[PDB]
Curated annotation (Swiss-Prot), chains A, D:
Protein name in UniProt: Ephrin-A1
MF GO annotations: ephrin receptor binding; signaling receptor binding
Localization: Cell membrane
Presence of keyword NAD: no
Function text: Cell surface GPI-bound ligand for Eph receptors, a family of receptor tyrosine kinases which are crucial for migration, repulsion and adhesion during neuronal, vascular and epithelial development. Binds promiscuously Eph receptors residing on adjacent cells, leading to contact-dependent bidirectional signaling into neighboring cells. Plays an important role in angiogenesis and tumor neovascularization. The recruitment of VAV2, VAV3 and PI3-kinase p85 subunit by phosphorylated EPHA2 is critical for EFNA1-induced RAC1 GTPase activation and vascular endothelial cell migration and assembly.
Induction: By TNF and IL1B/interleukin-1 beta.
Family of the protein in this entry: Belongs to the ephrin family.
Superkingdom per UniProt: Eukaryota
Region of the whole protein represented: 19 to 148 of 205
From Swiss-Prot, chains B, C:
Function: Receptor tyrosine kinase which binds promiscuously membrane-bound ephrin-A family ligands residing on adjacent cells, leading to contact-dependent bidirectional signaling into neighboring cells. The signaling pathway downstream of the receptor is referred to as forward signaling while the signaling pathway downstream of the ephrin ligand is referred to as reverse signaling. Activated by the ligand ephrin-A1/EFNA1 regulates migration, integrin-mediated adhesion, proliferation and differentiation of cells.
Tissue specificity field: Expressed in brain and glioma tissue and glioma cell lines (at protein level). Expressed most highly in tissues that contain a high proportion of epithelial cells, e.g. skin, intestine, lung, and ovary.
UniProt-annotated location(s): Cell membrane; Cell projection, Ruffle membrane; Cell projection, Lamellipodium membrane; Cell junction, Focal adhesion
This protein's name: Ephrin type-A receptor 2
Region described as Mediates interaction with CLDN4: spans on this chain: 1-182
Assembly and oligomerization: Homodimer. Interacts with SLA. Interacts (phosphorylated form) with VAV2, VAV3 and PI3-kinase p85 subunit (PIK3R1, PIK3R2 or PIK3R3); critical for the EFNA1-induced activation of RAC1 which stimulates cell migration. Interacts with INPPL1; regulates activated EPHA2 endocytosis and degradation. Interacts (inactivated form) with PTK2/FAK1 and interacts (EFNA1 ligand-activated form) with PTPN11; regulates integrin-mediated adhesion. Interacts with ARHGEF16, DOCK4 and ELMO2; mediates ligand-independent activation of RAC1 which stimulates cell migration. (Microbial infection) Interacts with human herpes virus 8/HHV-8 glycoprotein L/gL and glycoprotein H/gH heterodimer; this interaction triggers EPHA2 phosphorylation and endocytosis, allowing virus entry.
Superkingdom of origin organism: Eukaryota
Family designation: Belongs to the protein kinase superfamily. Tyr protein kinase family. Ephrin receptor subfamily.
Gene name per UniProt: EPHA2
Disease affiliated with this protein: Cataract 6, multiple types: An opacification of the crystalline lens of the eye that frequently results in visual impairment or blindness. Opacities vary in morphology, are often confined to a portion of the lens, and may be static or progressive. CTRCT6 includes posterior polar and age-related cortical cataracts, among others. Posterior polar cataract is a subcapsular opacity, usually disk-shaped, located at the back of the lens. Age-related cortical cataract is a developmental punctate opacity restricted to the cortex.
């Protein structure tokens, strides 16, 4: 099954800086980028990073080798740009990540053109 | 090589292209990683410890067009069955490449019984356990080819039997010999044949103000399976009064007959020749 | 009407044609009943008592070709919400007809946001409870049309909001004015336009051995949205010495000028005229 | 879910003339016609009839208005010819059938070109 996550400042789940989702193996996490149809400058755009607890706590990435997906298409014709992460135990692709049972994984944001008012982050925990 | 005409290109579709999976849902899955600071997509399957695996990934219906021989360029990664520290009994390190011809798109109505096995695709570089931490991508390239194709279109299929595969690219194309201008002759774009030795003899048409000399071989070219124009026979030469195109001689210069030679000056009195309005035998000093 | 060029025909596919359903599996379903001793298939949905229904049936990708205005012929049945003796609160008696243009087939990657509403299709004959036992089929016919189409191809979609519908036919076609021979002139096959009043003026080319007389209007035809050739202007007539085609006059018969008139006999001495090898003014009795 | 039924004399489930399948609402019954790739005359072909208990017991149909599907394509290119019956409570098509809870439905065969050695029939019961 799948867990929908609308990654935007207007989501109240991000306001306490402790947004946490609980998943089971072989499940998908659908991170929905901001989407519009509004001022072209006011359109939120983020860089999603799959990181470690240190990068999560400090809300700052250590390297570009952590960049997961780009929310660079806010007024996309087709629909909202998404990042669909299968929480699979095994991957045939090395640059991708394997999700072990009983572990926590962290996602962090960085505004592409806007100012960082608050820290946008999510914690995914495998049951 | 010659000119390639691309009929399908998965990595160019920007994730927007959706391929049917059978059984529905289960099996292959679309992934979204980042490679060389570029967003990329891929079809993955890794049901190595389940068993009785028969997971089909079928591309969409591809309009054959004029194509006789299609070329299939696959870029994939395959993980070794000993890379699983748990131990996978029903594990495989291959997948089978299939194709099917049809005059109609069946859409969701997929039937394995209609697919012909092209080959058993094996990795040349197998993903070992140490590769993940090393962030080393072992990207395998396999080119296969099918011919002659005859129906309105085809599908390509990737059937998995319980392996750990990540398919990053599927690019189907056919070759053509390009529209050529050679030996003052025009040779049209010609579809390359299906049979490996075969060479289609293509007749040439002389360019504007060029002619095939009497006795001289008529301009001809041979089109090869790779799209190359091979073995030129004959040529065209600029007609009387003309000298890469055929243009008339500058005043006071002439050309009597069609030849390789350019327009010579006019001693001592257009153009095919220079008038004296005496000589008995019209290119000689009159 | 003129000539129809069929781009899609569900009832002709013999069940072999599979259309994507969204959400996957749920919603519309393929059925196999017998009608007039003939095997038939259909797409049905009847989630009348569930609620929050948004069931999409999307046809496969249709190559537009040269088509400017497509015609959509639907044959379906719809059941009344009072025909359920249980009572259906979230019940509807309509479905919405959508379309989408694309230069690429997205296959399984269906996105509602890309579809434009053609119309709210309603039954003209609603299925009441007494109809089942009576074995009466109330088969509704609805023709809709979209133009101008411009991209490489399109999809048609049937979105259901919680009704009891059975779709037996979906036939998409475009019209053309056929290759015509009229007034001793040839008019090529012309694609009918998209705009309802529009009439494309098509120039004619005179048949073998026919000419447009001096002063006389040049042969022209007008192609209508339905594929009809309307309002003939001008014509061709058989040239001097010729008399539905232009054939030379039989010996001893002649034709001086191009006209409607046939070849007249030769008193008293091919052909454009008859030689006397006297007359001062060559069609007069010499 | 779906129940596979290979309708052929070689199926031992038909030999006691009491083949019975138990279904739940909204489920499919997949009746798989005989399929080959054998002598063109020896290829079994049947007329499937959805009938009443009287027609079931006697194994004989009362009218053509009972004919369900034809197994007339035994050497079919695509694969075996099938008849997929959704055991749905409601139908938008009048010539089709509605399947009520707690009822029994009966299917009977008739060889198209061959001889009727035994009676081929199936009973479907809704839970």
């Amino acid at each position: 099954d799948r867990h929908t996550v609308f990654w935007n400042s207007s989501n109240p789940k991000f306001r306490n800086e402790d947004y946490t989702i609980h998943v089971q193996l072989n499940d998908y996490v659908d991170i929905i980028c901001p989407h519009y149809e509004v001022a072209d400058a006011a359109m939120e755009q983020y860089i999603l990073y799959l990181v470690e607890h240190e990068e999560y706590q400090l809300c700052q990435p250590q390297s570009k080798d952590q960049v997961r997906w780009q929310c660079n298409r806010p007024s996309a014709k087709h629909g909202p740009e998404k990042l669909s992460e299968k929480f699979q135990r095994f991957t045939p692709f090395t640059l991708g990540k394997e999700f072990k049972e009983g572990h926590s994984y962290y996602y962090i944001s960085k505004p592409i053109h806007q100012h960082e008012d608050r820290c946008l982050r999510l914690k995914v925990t495998v049951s | 090589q010659g000119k390639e005409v691309v009929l399908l290109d998965f990595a160019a579709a920007g994730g927007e292209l959706g391929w049917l999976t059978h059984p529905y849902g289960k099996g292959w899955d679309l992934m979204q990683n980042i490679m060389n600071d570029m967003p990329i997509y891929m079809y993955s399957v890794c049901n190595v410890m389940s068993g009785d695996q028969d997971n089909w990934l079928r591309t969409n219906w591809v309009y054959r067009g004029e194509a006789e021989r299609i070329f299939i360029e696959l870029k994939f990664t395959v993980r070794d069955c000993n890379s699983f520290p748990g131990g996978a009994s029903s594990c495989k390190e291959t997948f089978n490449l299939y194709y099917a011809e049809s005059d109609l798109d069946y859409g969701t109505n997929f039937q394995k019984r209609l697919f012909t096995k092209i080959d058993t695709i094996a990795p040349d570089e197998i993903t070992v356990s140490s590769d993940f931490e090393a962030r080393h991508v072992k990207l395998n390239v396999e080119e296969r080819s099918v011919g002659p194709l005859t129906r309105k279109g085809f599908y390509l299929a990737f059937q998995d039997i319980g392996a750990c595969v990540a398919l990053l690219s599927v690019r189907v194309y056919y070759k053509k010999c390009p529209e050529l201008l050679q030996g003052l002759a025009h040779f049209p774009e010609t579809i390359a044949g299906s049979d490996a030795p075969s060479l289609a003899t293509v007749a040439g048409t002389c360019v504007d103000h060029a002619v095939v000399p009497p006795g001289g071989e008529e301009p001809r070219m041979h089109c090869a399976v790779d799209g190359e124009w091979l073995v030129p026979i004959g040529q065209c030469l600029c007609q009387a009064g003309y000298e890469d195109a055929c243009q008339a001689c500058s005043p006071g210069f002439f050309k009597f007959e069609a030849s390789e030679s350019p327009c010579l000056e006019c001693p001592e009195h257009g153009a095919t020749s220079c008038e004296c309005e005496r000589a008995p035998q019209a290119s000689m000093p009159c």
